[PDB]
Amino acid sequence: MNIFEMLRIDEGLRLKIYKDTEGYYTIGIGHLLTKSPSLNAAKLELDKAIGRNTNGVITKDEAEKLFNQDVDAAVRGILRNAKLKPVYDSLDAVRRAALINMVFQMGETGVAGFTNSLRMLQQKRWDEAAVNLAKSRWYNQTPNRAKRVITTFRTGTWDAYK
Ligand SMILES: [Cl-]
Ligand SMILES: [Cl-]
């Protein structure tokens, strides 16, 4: 298991514009297009992302290309961030993937907002961090996915994805 297989399980794959759990236009593997309610604003963002007139539909290769870009962007965003980088440096390989997962879903700003949990993870207080992470809108809105990521932090294994 690795970050790509993990996120592909969490996000799924859709080749036609869809709305995410928050109602936002998305496509492929969790690639947020726009927060705007306009489906047209979404098709435009899409064409701009792909470099061709897509009319709302992309191929598997195109989806995978956006995916590769978003994962790389998530890692780079963690490493540039003063609050995230030290947490990341502190973790083992598995847990690093769980942090990338959270950043991929909610963005660097959102995650950086989990200040207390981050301090607990840095200190390797697994059980405690797991409990703190659960007291969140994130957990309450997408519980199954949150539990899988939280279990990853708690155990340091891929058991929740197996
Ligand atoms: Cl893009
Ligand atoms: Cl979920």
Query: How many A from CA of 72 to the centre of ligand 2?
Result: 23
- Give every CB contact of residue 120 below 8 A, 6+ residues apart in sequence: 128, 129, 132
Examine the residue annotation and report whether 11 is marked as an active-site residue of this protein.
Answer: yes
Q: What is the identity of the amino acid at 59?
A: T
CA 96 to ligand 2 center in whole angstroms:
20
Known binding-site residue numbers:
32, 104, 117, 132
Catalytic option among 10, 11, 45, 70: 11
Task: State the distance from the centre of ligand 1 to the C-alpha of 71, rounded, in angstroms.
Answer: 12
Number of domains in the chain: 1
Experimental method: X-ray
132: helix, strand or coil = helix
According to DSSP, residue 58 is labeled: -
CA angle 39, 67, 73 (to 5 degrees): 100
Alpha helix segments (H runs only) across the chain: 3-11, 39-50, 60-80, 85-90, 93-112, 115-122, 126-134, 137-141, 143-155
> Does residue 64 have an active-site annotation?
no
Instruction: For residues 134 and 116, give the distance between their C-alpha atoms in angstroms, rounded to a whole number.
Output: 12
Block residue for tokens 């990338």: 100
Given the residues 5, 10, 20, 61, the one annotated as active site: 20
Domain with 42 in it: what CATH number? 1.10.530.40
Domain assignment of residue 140, given as a range: 1-162
Nearest 5 degrees, angle CA 71-CA 140-CA 70?
10
- Residue 46's contacts (CB-CB under 8 Å, 6 or more residues apart) are 17, 27, 33, 54, 56, 58
